[PDB]
Structure of Uracil-DNA glycosylase:
Amino acid sequence: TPTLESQFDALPPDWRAILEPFVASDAYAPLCRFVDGERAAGKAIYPADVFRALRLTHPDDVKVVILGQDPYHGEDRGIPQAHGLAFSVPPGVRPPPSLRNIFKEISADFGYEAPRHGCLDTWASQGVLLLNTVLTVERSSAASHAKRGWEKCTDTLIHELATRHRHLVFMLWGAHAQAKRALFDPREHCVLEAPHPSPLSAHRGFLGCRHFALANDYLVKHGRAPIDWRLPDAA
Ligand SMILES: [Cl-]
Ligand SMILES: [Cl-]
Ligand SMILES: [Cl-]
């Protein structure tokens, strides 16, 4: 796996500019040494492609920001669930319960069928930034990995993105994601809040929130093409 610094350096210039306050901070080198040292010590740290969400969705192309907290720490048939996009799972992995509830809301909102798989790459290529606020995890451990270092980084990301690009849609699910409103001006953006889609909270108001339809209304209001919330038949 490339060192974390090399993964920061490989980002497009537009993302590097948004992350520069963090990369210039005292927290950057320690985060890099921690993640690199965990891998060097033989721990199963996921995903390998830490910034996949950013590589697939460049800043100018961001339309919708969907926050997760930690990457999945589980696996399915020996394939890790985390692959660098919030909520998404790679081809060959069954959708976990939170993602099934996301799909249930889309199916109810638009009448689409339940997808065959859980890979959200094709939403990222349409401008859906699928950003976990903590971007690494240790296999089978629910403990957040480098929580404080990563959140300094993704806090910088959210603030700088939102300050440079007006009229984004933010889907903020759960209290942790909703607290990220402190990082931007909510009158300049569409802020959609609901409980988290996990089964523990989904029936408190995630199911029924209509966020995917609301997001598309706001995009069209601002002259942008709406998201196709379907998924192609194969991943
Ligand atoms: Cl370059
Ligand atoms: Cl700049
Ligand atoms: Cl710092």
Notes: The longest helix spans residues 147-164. The CA atoms of residues 116 and 233 lie 7 Å apart. The chain has one domain: 4-221.
